[PDB]
Structure formats: structure tokens, C-alpha cells
Design a protein around this ligand. Structure first.
Ligand SMILES: Nc1ccn([C@H]2C[C@H](O)[C@@H](COP(=O)(O)OP(=O)(O)OP(=O)(O)O)O2)c(=O)n1
Ligand SMILES: Nc1ccn([C@H]2C[C@H](O)[C@@H](COP(=O)(O)OP(=O)(O)OP(=O)(O)O)O2)c(=O)n1
Ligand SMILES: Nc1ccn([C@H]2C[C@H](O)[C@@H](COP(=O)(O)OP(=O)(O)OP(=O)(O)O)O2)c(=O)n1
Ligand SMILES: Nc1ccn([C@H]2C[C@H](O)[C@@H](COP(=O)(O)OP(=O)(O)OP(=O)(O)O)O2)c(=O)n1
Ligand SMILES: Nc1ccn([C@H]2C[C@H](O)[C@@H](COP(=O)(O)OP(=O)(O)OP(=O)(O)O)O2)c(=O)n1
Ligand SMILES: Nc1ccn([C@H]2C[C@H](O)[C@@H](COP(=O)(O)OP(=O)(O)OP(=O)(O)O)O2)c(=O)n1
Ligand SMILES: O=C1N[C@H](O)C=CN1[C@H]1C[C@H](O)[C@H](COP(=O)(O)O)O1
Ligand SMILES: O=C1N[C@H](O)C=CN1[C@H]1C[C@H](O)[C@H](COP(=O)(O)O)O1
Ligand SMILES: O=C1N[C@H](O)C=CN1[C@H]1C[C@H](O)[C@H](COP(=O)(O)O)O1
Ligand SMILES: O=C1N[C@H](O)C=CN1[C@H]1C[C@H](O)[C@H](COP(=O)(O)O)O1
Ligand SMILES: O=C1N[C@H](O)C=CN1[C@H]1C[C@H](O)[C@H](COP(=O)(O)O)O1
Ligand SMILES: O=C1N[C@H](O)C=CN1[C@H]1C[C@H](O)[C@H](COP(=O)(O)O)O1
Ligand SMILES: [Mg+2]
Ligand SMILES: [Mg+2]
Ligand SMILES: [Mg+2]
Ligand SMILES: [Mg+2]
Ligand SMILES: [Mg+2]
Ligand SMILES: [Mg+2]
Ligand SMILES: [Zn+2]
Ligand SMILES: [Zn+2]
Ligand SMILES: [Zn+2]
Ligand SMILES: [Zn+2]
Ligand SMILES: [Zn+2]
Ligand SMILES: [Zn+2]
Ligand SMILES: [Zn+2]
Ligand SMILES: [Zn+2]
Ligand SMILES: [Zn+2]
Ligand SMILES: [Zn+2]
Ligand SMILES: [Zn+2]
Ligand SMILES: [Zn+2]
Lengths: 146, 146, 147, 147, 146, 146
């Protein structure tokens, strides 16, 4: 039976399947007391162009078109009025500095990630100072459907 | 990529992977405006015995030990104070009469399911009266992890 | 001689039961957090569907399956509105059935106070015991309203 | 002969008034949204402070100022818990004073149903009129609970 | 830079600038963990006449037309469904007995005020009994805009 | 008497007075139906170093140390569980691309700003496509305190 860690990392990878930016298919699942409260994948602002259709918007070696997966989970909370305080997050890719700041500021207490994607040393510095646990964990092998 | 329908049915199946009652491994995902707001699988009341460990509690041909997947999604909303009104649900198995009544009463507006499990005609009657569609949809074939 | 909290809320549960539309048992439930009422419910059909009063019971295995139960109507008020039922207690006219018991325990209801020892399911007792939730019998007080 | 919604909630307001601790008027209030109870209140001292029953009234200009009013206790339940009082109606045993009237109107309470025509302030009427909020008199129904 | 106390007292004074009762221009800011969660100024019920236009409604030496600043902050919470428990309030004027009772009942834990307006001894009595400090603090001199 | 626009822009400037990054003192006030629901200024993640004390963290010509003012307002909503949908925002400085994406995604419908700060053409493109109104408005001259 899938452990909680495997259960949520698998969910993060499934969530990434709708990513519309082929630089990285990113999925995030926000969890409170082992319950899923929000999810997100990387894509353009809702009702705007996606990279799949009009191409990336590159600036300083990053695609700036997308709302990031982690940010989409947090913004789901802000839009609906759901508390993200005292949560943990499972993400397919290590959070960029912008996502890191938002997550820490929102009260996210633990970050579990699969891919060591472009790890920013300042993101590590912030997680360390804020005493937020970060953990690498592989997505388990799971087959769904017939 | 995965359609919204495929995306959520896949999620429901993944959610079912932690089911602790082997009569049916059930998973449910509650969705509002294409966002996941709650999930649930079938298992004993939290902090109580599960069928996997102590056996089913059978009455009139049903296992009564478990909080049902759909009920776990709704009760997540009740416990946390998340609104379930104007949602839809994706579930691995057709809802029983008890789950159907609760879902309809909560303001769930559409039901999508995979397995046509023990369909109760009174459940159909109520869904029809409430103008809530019950749509069969197969779980897509999806492979997660390496 | 003011109504105690227990009497106050049990009286309320009985009053709440006065709109029940299934004559097998007129059930009323009041959900309480820190001695404040946050939700109520009585037993009746799904909203906007038929009630037993009008079309008869829908019997299955010796139970009327037509109704959303009183306790469930309280919990579903919370789920529908987005009101937290965690760390509450409930006052109910009738001892909760196994389905209501599971939902209450799962929602974080910490104590159950009931009047009528209605069809008490031994498995409901087993679960309340394991989950460490008290189930107290308390009579509805004699209260006259109006005039 | 089931209790109508109006009778159901007015009965509830009267029951709620049974814990009032200021004998100048036993006031009870029930806040309702889409025929669901979301909050209640009776008149009594600030929580954890003295009640009139025990220490006497605190009179100022012909009013007892000791109590948080029933209507205010309902609204404050909402403010303290974070429950939305917008687009509600209220049922109250006594017509709201000017302070309660202002707070109710400001909170988005859309209709006021009361039993007793208690010290009706003409300025309260003026405000309800301008704000377009109905104020309906309705008797508490004769209801016997218990035994 | 401005201390938290100066920051919020300044805000309360700015909030008071829209007051429509010239007996006292009152502003209130409701704060939870140094975040502003609601504000209010004294004026008529929304969509009703204001004192500026039709005059005061005087009774027993008080203008009864207005919803008070503090009450407007609390009622913002009630209307929207924002929790006022475990807050503090900053107000331009010492709260009257009605506002004091409501604030204490709502779970407001500290009161900071500038002007010692019409102090009611019963208000002091209740604050003291509830172990809620009432702190006088001057509005700082702050110039905004060019 | 201060118009609503002047009232909230003045508030945004006052909010900026606690900024701890001297590259730009930024303040934001999030408004729903002319009520203030959240505020923010630019500063380090809560309980971490500020630029005032340890210097800026410069990357590609931007200080990346700070959680931005707008982001702090939105994250207040996410942390507490307050809905930011159907709001408008008043900000001392035109939002950067990251803030722009988050605001649009959160359901912010109008942006009023004072300073035309480093206006990103892609932020304009997004506001335009998302049909979000943006308006320049000067902070009014307001003196507070004696
Ligand atoms: N469950 C969801 C739903 C949406 N989003 C985010 C990802 C994108 O940033 C944006 C997509 O929202 P749209 O309203 O544009 O949804 P579409 O149906 O158009 O999907 P897409 O744009 O991905 O085709 O919202 C998300 O992270 N998770
Ligand atoms: N994401 C979740 C978490 C919990 N539950 C439900 C399923 C069971 O009815 C019960 C399990 O909760 P526990 O607190 O017992 O969690 P455990 O870690 O013990 O899991 P399990 O009992 O499944 O081993 O809660 C759920 O549906 N979905
Ligand atoms: N205060 C309330 C309101 C409703 N309900 C539940 C009981 C029934 O299961 C259903 C009744 O909802 P309707 O929308 O059908 O309300 P009616 O006004 O039609 O009442 P009834 O059907 O009882 O005549 O909702 C409840 O328990 N408590
Ligand atoms: N269901 C409730 C609970 C409380 N209150 C209000 C009425 C009083 O203004 C105050 C009473 O709160 P306490 O915390 O003092 O409660 P007690 O248990 O001490 O009740 P009492 O003081 O009435 O004996 O709160 C209310 O209106 N409705
Ligand atoms: N940010 C706000 C908005 C409103 N109110 C309160 C003060 C008055 O009691 C009433 C004013 O609300 P209106 O809906 O009448 O707003 P107007 O735009 O008409 O403002 P005014 O009446 O002050 O001109 O609401 C408040 O305290 N703070
Ligand atoms: N009303 C508030 C309170 C906080 N913050 C944001 C700005 C900074 O990003 C961070 C500051 O939070 P701290 O918990 O560090 O508060 P301090 O009391 O330490 O203030 P500072 O760090 O500004 O000295 O939170 C904000 O925008 N608005
Ligand atoms: O969604 C996330 N989350 C993580 O925080 C990092 C990147 N992303 C997205 C952003 C972009 O679409 C991306 C590839 O990232 P860069 O373009 O920044 O290398 O994956
Ligand atoms: O979780 C759901 N959801 C559906 O509503 C139906 C059954 N179930 C569960 C209940 C039990 O654990 C089960 C097998 O169902 P029966 O024991 O009722 O046949 O799957
Ligand atoms: O509302 C509750 N709450 C309790 O959990 C038990 C039964 N009921 C209702 C269900 C039905 O309408 C009923 C009579 O119960 P039975 O038909 O299950 O005996 O009272
Ligand atoms: O609870 C309410 N609600 C109504 O708004 C009016 C009065 N009251 C209370 C206040 C006091 O305890 C009271 C008797 O009122 P007066 O002391 O103002 O006459 O009943
Ligand atoms: O807004 C507050 N808050 C304080 O609690 C006291 C008075 N006020 C208002 C009420 C009226 O508009 C006012 C002048 O008060 P009096 O009219 O009660 O003296 O300032
Ligand atoms: O708070 C905001 N909000 C706006 O979106 C833009 C910048 N800022 C902050 C970020 C940094 O502390 C800043 C000066 O911005 P740059 O360092 O990106 O030029 O003001
Ligand atoms: Mg799209
Ligand atoms: Mg368990
Ligand atoms: Mg009906
Ligand atoms: Mg007491
Ligand atoms: Mg007005
Ligand atoms: Mg700090
Ligand atoms: Zn891209
Ligand atoms: Zn990122
Ligand atoms: Zn089983
Ligand atoms: Zn079921
Ligand atoms: Zn029946
Ligand atoms: Zn039941
Ligand atoms: Zn009294
Ligand atoms: Zn009153
Ligand atoms: Zn006046
Ligand atoms: Zn006042
Ligand atoms: Zn800096
Ligand atoms: Zn920014």
C-alpha cells in the first residue's frame, strides 16, 4: 500500500500531466493533516495564452509566461479563502526562489520534491533560516487504468 | 494531454490506492470549477480499526465498517469548513444511496464514476429528480514514476 | 432554575425535530461549538424531493431510506456552507444510527448527547468507544413556549 | 399542522431567550440563512463577567447597559467565528433597539421578524424603512417540549 | 521607521478621514498578528442618510445616527465571515460602552486609542475584568503624498 | 473629503512606511466592495533577514530578497483563508510580472498604482488579455498627527 509520501508524490506527478509549458511539467499538491486542500500545475494565467500554443516567454533564461505549480496551489487558497497555514507541499520540481518565498510566507512548513530542478542557493538559505524542512522523494511507479 | 474528465478520474483512481476495505477500492475527488477541494477513500473511522486488519463488519450484505470515499470527501469539507456547494464529484465507483443523498444535499451538481457498482434505483431516482447527471467514464491508462 | 446548557440544547433538538417529515421517528439535531449553535437538522427527504409524509416511506431492510438523517443534515449544513464542525458536540433526539455515527466521528464531533435510545447499533457503540467519544443520555426538559 | 418556518424560528427564538440573565426582558435571537440556523443569542453580560441576575442591572438613561443584546450576541458569534451574516434574516423575541438595528442592517440582515413590540424606537423604524428591510410581527406559537 | 503601534495608529487616523459625523471623526483598524483584517469609520448605515447631509440624530447627548468606527470594523467581520477572535484594535477615540461590550465579546484582546473621548467607567470596569489593556497612544506625525 | 480612490492610495503609501528594502518602498491594500481585507509591504520572508540589515540580494538587476507588497497582501489571504476573488488592489508601484500573474490568477479585477515603476510590457499584455483594468492615480497630500 502506498505510504503517505508515495501517495502524495504520485498525486503531484499526476497533477503535472496538464502542464502547458514543456520546459518542465510541474505539479503541486498542498496537504494539511494528510488531506489534499489544493493543487496546481504550471500554465499561463487562466484565460490567457499558454506556451504550448504561442511559445515560451523567455527572460534571463526562465519562461515567465507561467503561473508556477506551487503558486497555483497557493492562489487556489487565496481565491477561495482556504487557509494554507500549517500545511506541507509535495511538488514534482524543487521550488524556484519566488515560489519558495511565497510558500514560506504562507505558513507552509515542509516541502517534498522529486526533481532537483535548478536549485537556487538563496532558496536553500531561506528554507534554512525559516526552519522549513525540505525532503527529496522519488515519484513511485504507479499504473492507473486498464 | 489529459482532458479534465480523464485528469480527475485518474486522480480518483490514484486516491483509491489507500483503501483499506478489499470489497471495493474506492476513491473520490471533489471538484469546484476544475479545482480539487477535497478527496477521500474508503476506510474505517480515523484512528479506528480497518477491514485490512480486523476483517469486514458485514450487515445485510454490506460492509458497514468504512466511511465511504464520497463521504470522506464531504466530511473533509464539514470538518475543515470548506464549501462543497456547486461542486462535482469524480468517483471510482457509483455512489450508494447514503452517499447519493449526502452529495445531493450538499449541493454536488454532477457525478462522474467508473465502475457501475451496486446501482441502487432510488439513488438514480433522486439524482434524476435533482437534475444531477451521473456520467460513466473510464479511468484513463496513465503510468506514473520511473 | 434557568435551563442548564444540557437542558437548553436538548430542548432545542426536540424543537428542531418538529419539522420532521418521516413519522417513523421525529428526529432533531443541534450541533454545538463552545456552547454556541452552529448548525441544526431534522430528518426529511433530500431538499426539493418527496417527503414520507406525502409519498410514504421508502423501506429497505427495515429502515426508511428516503430521509437525510437529522445529524447528517447538521453536518451537511456545515459542508455546504463551509462551517467547521471540528471540535463540536451534538445534541440529538434519537441515538445516532451507524451511518450518522461514522460521519459524526469522522467530522470531529467529540461528544454525543441523546434523548431516545433508538435502535442502538452495537457497532456504533464499538466505534464511539474506540474513538473515545462520550455518549450521554439526557431527557428533553419540560418546556412550554408561547401564549 | 407542522410548524411553518416562521413558527419554527420564532419558537426557537423564545427557547433561546430561556437563558437570559437580565429580567427587564428575556430576549432571544436566531439568525437564519436560507432557512438554516447559523447563529443564536440571548441577552446577558459580557462573557466571563457579572450578570444582572447576580449583581443587579447597570442602569443608564432608563436602559440596562450591562448586557450584550440577543441580536448582538448572534452577530458577534458570526464575527468571532468568521461566519458570514450577509443575506440573512433574524427572528427575535423583542423588537430591536436602535443599536441592534444599526448593527443588523450594516451586517446585511435583510428581514427582521419579532414577537414583542418592545420600546420601538421611531429612528429604528426610519432606518429599516430607508434601508428597505421588512419588520414583521409574528407571535411565538404555543409549543410544548418534553415529557 | 514607524513602530507597529505608530503604523496602526496612523492607519486609524487615516481611516477616520471619511467620517461623516462631525462630533468626532473616528477611525478603527482591527489587527491580528500585526495584519490588518478590517477597518471602519463612523457614519450612517450604508445606503442611508449621513449627519453631514441631514444633521445629527441626537438622543441623551449622543448622536445615534452613526454605526461607530469600531462596530464597522467588527461588522465587516460578521458580514464577510472573517474571524475577529484574538485580535487587537487601534482606534482614534476611546470606545463607548456599546463598542466596548461588542469588542470584548468578539475576542478583541487589546485596545489602543488616541483621544480620551467620553470615557465611561463601566467600559473601564469590563476591560479590566476581561484583562484587556486599554493603551493611550498618540497618532504619529506622518505626511503622505507630494 | 477623500474620495475612495484617494483614501485607498493614501493607505497604500502609509502601508509602504514599513518597507525594509530601500530600492522601492512599496505598499499594497487589497479592497473588496470598498472594504480593506489585506495589506502588504515589501520585506524579507517573515522571521528572516531584511535588506536594511544585511543588504539586497541582487539577481539580474532585481532584489530577490523581498516578498513583494502585492504578494504579501495575497499571501495574507492564503494564510488566513480570506477570499481575494473579485477584489481590486491599490499599490504604490506598478506590479512586476510575478505580482501581476499572481494578482490576475487570484481574481483581482482592477489595479490602481501611483509610480510607473519598471513597467514590464508582458505584464501589460497579460492585464490586457485578462481584461483587468489598470489605473494610474497619485497619492493625495495628507498630513496625519499633531
Ligand atoms: N486544477 C487546476 C486548474 C487550473 N490551474 C491553473 C493552471 C493554469 O495556470 C491555469 C489554467 O486555467 P484555465 O482557466 O485557463 O483552464 P483551462 O480549462 O483553459 O486549462 P488550460 O489553460 O490548462 O488548457 O490555472 C491549476 O493549476 N490547477
Ligand atoms: N487523505 C485522506 C486521509 C484520510 N481519509 C480517511 C480514510 C479513512 O476513513 C480515514 C483514515 O484516517 P487515519 O487518521 O486513520 O489515517 P492513517 O494514516 O491511519 O491511514 P489508514 O487508517 O488508512 O492507514 O480517513 C481519506 O479519505 N483521505
Ligand atoms: N433548517 C433546516 C432546513 C432543511 N433541513 C433539511 C431537512 C430536509 O432533509 C430538507 C428540507 O429542505 P427543503 O429545501 O425541501 O425545505 P422545505 O422548505 O421544502 O421543507 P420540507 O421539505 O421539510 O417541507 O433539508 C434541515 O434539516 N434543517
Ligand atoms: N449560546 C450562547 C452562548 C453565549 N451567549 C452570550 C450571552 C452572554 O452575553 C454570554 C454568556 O457567555 P459565558 O461565557 O459567560 O457563558 P456561561 O456559560 O457563563 O453562561 P451565563 O453567563 O449566561 O451563565 O454570551 C449567547 O448569547 N448564546
Ligand atoms: N471602508 C469602509 C466602508 C464603509 N464603512 C462604513 C462607514 C459607514 O457607516 C458606511 C458607509 O457605507 P456606504 O455603502 O454608504 O458607502 P459610501 O460610498 O456611500 O460612503 P459614505 O456614505 O461614507 O459617503 O459603511 C466603513 O466603516 N469603512
Ligand atoms: N502588516 C504586515 C505584516 C507583515 N508583512 C510582511 C512584510 C515582510 O515581508 C514580513 C515582515 O514580517 P515579520 O513577521 O518579520 O514582522 P516584523 O515585526 O519582524 O517586521 P519587520 O521584519 O518588517 O521588521 O511580513 C506585511 O506585508 N504586512
Ligand atoms: O511551476 C514551476 N515550479 C517551480 O517553482 C519551478 C518552475 N516552474 C515552472 C515555470 C516554467 O513554466 C518552468 C520551467 O522553469 P524555468 O523556465 O524557470 O526554468 O516550470
Ligand atoms: O466507498 C464507497 N463508496 C460507494 O458509495 C459505495 C461503496 N463504498 C465502499 C463501502 C465498502 O467499504 C465498499 C464495498 O461496498 P459494500 O460493502 O457496501 O458492497 O466500498
Ligand atoms: O434522523 C435520524 N437520525 C438517527 O441517526 C436515526 C434515524 N433517523 C431517521 C431516519 C428515518 O427517517 C428514521 C426512522 O429510522 P429508521 O427508518 O432507520 O428506523 O429517523
Ligand atoms: O437583548 C435585547 N435586544 C433588543 O435589541 C432590546 C433589548 N435587549 C435587552 C437589553 C436589556 O438586557 C434589555 C431590557 O432592555 P432595556 O434595559 O434597554 O429596556 O433586553
Ligand atoms: O465611532 C465612534 N466610536 C466610539 O466608540 C465613540 C463614538 N463614536 C462616534 C459616534 C458619533 O458619530 C460620535 C460622537 O460620539 P457621541 O455622539 O456619542 O458623543 O463618534
Ligand atoms: O514590492 C514590490 N512590488 C512590485 O511588484 C515591484 C517591486 N516590489 C519590491 C521588490 C523589491 O524589494 C523592489 C524594488 O524592486 P526591484 O528590486 O525588482 O527593482 O520593490
Ligand atoms: Mg486555459
Ligand atoms: Mg488509521
Ligand atoms: Mg421540501
Ligand atoms: Mg457567564
Ligand atoms: Mg453612503
Ligand atoms: Mg521581521
Ligand atoms: Zn513556457
Ligand atoms: Zn516557482
Ligand atoms: Zn470492509
Ligand atoms: Zn457510499
Ligand atoms: Zn420515512
Ligand atoms: Zn442516522
Ligand atoms: Zn440588566
Ligand atoms: Zn438591542
Ligand atoms: Zn452625527
Ligand atoms: Zn462606540
Ligand atoms: Zn532589497
Ligand atoms: Zn512584484
Amino acid at each position: 500500500r502506498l505510504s503517505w509520501q508515495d501517495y502524495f508524490m504520485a498525486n503531484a506527478e499526476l497533477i503535472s500531466k496538464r502542464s502547458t509549458c514543456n520546459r518542465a511539467y510541474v505539479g503541486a499538491v498542498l496537504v494539511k493533516n494528510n488531506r489534499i486542500i489544493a493543487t496546481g500545475y504550471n500554465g499561463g494565467v487562466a484565460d490567457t495564452d499558454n506556451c504550448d500554443d504561442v511559445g515560451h516567454e523567455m527572460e534571463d533564461g526562465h519562461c515567465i509566461r507561467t503561473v508556477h505549480a506551487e503558486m497555483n496551489a497557493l492562489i487556489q487558497c487565496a481565491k477561495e479563502g482556504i487557509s494554507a497555514n500549517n500545511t506541507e507541499i509535495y511538488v514534482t520540481h524543487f521550488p524556484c526562489i519566488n515560489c519558495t518565498k511565497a510558500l514560506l510566507q504562507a505558513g507552509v512548513k515542509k516541502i517534498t520534491y522529486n526533481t532537483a530542478y535548478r536549485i537556487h542557493p538563496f532558496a536553500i538559505e531561506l528554507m534554512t533560516q525559516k526552519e522549513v524542512e525540505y525532503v527529496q522523494h522519488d515519484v513511485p511507479r504507479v499504473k492507473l487504468g486498464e
